Ligand SMILES: Nc1nc2c(ncn2[C@@H]2O[C@H](COP(=O)(O)OP(=O)(O)OP(=O)(O)O)[C@@H](O)[C@H]2O)c(=O)[nH]1
Ligand SMILES: Nc1nc2c(ncn2[C@@H]2O[C@H](COP(=O)(O)OP(=O)(O)O)[C@@H](O)[C@H]2O)c(=O)[nH]1
Ligand SMILES: [Ca+2]
């Protein structure tokens with residue numbers, strides 16, 4: 001009975017610690033995923049705005065080429 | 070010892086906090102500067118009010134509270150207001166930009182910039198406590214800070230304080246005063262995310278409070294001040310247990326044992342009586358039996374639902390003021406014989422009752438009459454599930470077309486968190502069905 | 510403070526922006542020097558949203574005035590309040606655009622853009638907490654529409670996570686004869702669908718029709734059209750400019766109003782056009798009070814904001830807005846609950862004791878996009894006046910993509926108009 005008393009208190013401490021560990025890990029995986037995802041969407045936004053500057057080069061070029069006929 | 074720390078988040082949490090702390094100050098004879106003449110121990114003590122108030126050497130009584138918002142304007146009004154002297158500036162924490170009614174911004178994008186600082190200031194209050202009992206967390210379901218920052222904080226609080234108790238007061242959205250179309254989304258996400266981290270949550274349906282102000286106080290178009298004045302009486306009823314003592318006083322944690330039969334089933338329905346104008350209170354003694362009866366009128370409930378069509382798993386009655394046991398017994402006798410009160414079969418008994426002798430208080434220039442005696446009932450009914458069904462329905466109508474989802478995705482969320490939150494709420498609606506079915 | 514940076518581009522853009530600044534400067538009680546000479550504190554509580562401080566307690570519009578035509582800069586400077594603006598914020602070209610979009614967007618606009626940008630940054634870097642940008646412009650001319658959009662892309666690149674809000678003046682044959690306007694409007698819309706968060710469609714068609722048909726004005730000037738526009742602009746920015754709950758910043762507004770990122774083009778509405786609350790309310794939902802020339806009854810509202818100004822009963826407002834949604838349930842999509850929000854500001858505008866401003870995201874806005882599309886497809890089919898644009902470096906393909914992106918947008922509004930709760 002003395003060793004069952006030890007087990008029960010060991011089990012409580014273990015579940016409590018576990019709950020803290022899992023919450024700590026769930027949280028930090030969520031903050032990482034969220035950061036990749038957000039950054040990724042900002043990246044794509046900027047790449048698209050780039051390709052606009054590369055079309056506007058290729059337009060202003062197109063013009064100085066037909067303006068030597 | 071037995072301290073509680075209150076954390077007030079977002080506009081709703083903050084404004085409700087003001088209302089509560091003013092009420093607590095009047096109840097204890099605390100002045101706006103924090104001085105309390107009747108308190109003869111200076112710099113400290115272990116009196117019942119010290120569960121909520123610390124004391125400085127200079128005889129100041131200071132709320133054990135933190136107020137947090139992602140935007141400064143609501144908290145600036147506490148900083149420059151009637152009660153500015155009461156708080157230490159570092160208990161009033163603000164950012165520059167809000168969550169914009171977006172859970173994702175409160176939980177991640179803006180919230181992550183300020184969470185470490187918030188936990189710090191909380192830590193400084195915990196360290197002043199000889200035997201911390203827990204947290205009381207006040208917030209809206211619908212705002213971005215209220216929803217997303219609160220759930221981040223609850224998560225982090227589980228990490229830094231283990232399983233130290235965390236109780237919530239949550240404002241459930243209503244169309245008359247709502248400020249955002251996506252409130253259903255924020256509601257489901259924060260509820261899903263907070264569910265494992267909270268020991269007990271009292272929902273306040275803004276529509277229900279709104280109605281009570283209109284019906285029982287003849288207020289044509291209630292403001293947040295009308296509502297918060299009412300809410301704070303309910304909160305005061307609940308906390309009075311802790312801030313006072315008396316022979317027949319019964320502690321909030323004892324009610325809790327009875328209110329939560331299962332960790333997920335932790336949402337009690339509150340009801341409060343009497344709510345009456347001065348004009349109608351004049352020459353009207355509301356007896357113990359009358360205020361008790363009022364507890365079982367669904368229109369005095371703070372969440373709209375119908376307990377008459379559900380089953381009770383607990384009834385707790387918190388009487389305050391001029392109440393004695395003989396009258397309570399008679400009152401409850403009457404109700405048992407003449408009302409629809411069906412208990413589940415695994416809870417044969419039943420009702421639990423306490424009395425706080427300290428009389429109810431009202432704020433000057435309020436709409437509430439001052440009464441000799443009052444009661445708050447906390448019951449655990451399966452009917453509170455109706456509140457979730459309605460939200461869940463609003464959620465599904467939008468989610469099916471992904472309306473507004475791109476605002477959340479652009480801040481880093483995935484559709485998988487929406488469906489996961491919603492699944493968790495389906496399960497919770499199922500859990501409230503299962504508890505109510507009879508045993509074999 | 511949550512600051513907004515204003516940018517007016519072109520003739521339309523500068524006319525209306527000046528009007529806007531006169532109007533609200535009056536509402537906040539500040540004169541053309543820049544001094545507060547007013548009665549109440551409501552006026553200065555959120556004045557930082559639009560005004561910088563200088564010492565000598567001066568208030569300076571956080572505003573940037575832009576045109577390829579040098580003249581418009583003088584008319585502005587001479588106008589009332591012309592001297593309240595910051596002189597370094599005036600940024601003029603010399604050439605002028607002559608209603609060619611590709612000049613504003615791809616060549617002569619591109620030369621000038623960098624120096625507008627310099628002003629924007631300067632203004633952005635003083636901001637405690639920038640919320641974003643609002644641009645006033647037309648889609649028919651060539652500077653306001655073409656350089657206007659280039660700015661939008663350019664700003665969106667340096668400030669991707671800020672809100673980008675346009676007041677875009679849509680073109681009407683009834684107001685301007687300039688045969689090439691449906692090209693500039695289509696190419697602008699192509700840009701706007703991709704790069705703004707919210708755009709108020711201020712339609713010259715409807716401003717004419719209200720001026721002719723309602724106001725009894727036989728031939729109306731810009732000064733009359735714009736009298737409506739300034740009333741509107743003041744109205745839709747009331748929530749940003751005074752204390753309040755609903756839509757108090759550009760982002761909360763985008764979040765309430767834009768359920769799908771591309772579907773961000775609004776019908777504004779105003780009443781009275783020149784009352785009791787039930788009259789204001791019925792009028793503001795009338796097709797005839799709509800600053801875009803669409804009939805709400807030909808589509809469904811995805812979302813709506815509604816703002817009342819004046820001393821009135823809030824109970825009365827609440828009942829009336831309930832009443833309108835009930836009697837008109839069919840014209841609000843059912844799968845977005847509580848999609849109509851209402852605000853009440855005690856401060857009425859000038860000259861009115863009470864007004865109502867409306868902001869709808871209705872699927873009937875495809876009527877406006879279809880009208881342009883018809884006009885545009887009249888030309889492009891018989892490749893008319895195209896040489897003005899191939900001239901400055903463009904390919905035809907781009908004209909096509911701008912076309913099928915605007916038809917795509919029309920069919921998306923249709924698609925959500927047709928959708929049911931099951
Ligand atoms: N009962 C009550 N409800 C309030 C109060 N203030 C706001 N609300 C409600 O709270 C919800 C909106 O969330 P807020 O608390 O304003 O938002 P927030 O927490 O500040 O989040 P953001 O402003 O988005 O950063 C809506 O349901 C409002 O009706 C208040 O003082 N009392
Ligand atoms: N409502 C309104 N529309 C205008 C005003 N000025 C010009 N417009 C319209 O704007 C379009 C021409 O653009 P404008 O600003 O003059 O061209 P830009 O200056 O070269 O960009 C036409 O369709 C005009 O009818 C104005 O003051 N008010
Ligand atoms: Ca003491």
Ligand SMILES: [Mg+2]
Pocket residue numbers: 079080140167212214
């Ligand atoms: Mg807020």
Ligand SMILES: [Mg+2]
Pocket residue numbers: 519520578605606607608650651652
């Ligand atoms: Mg021009």
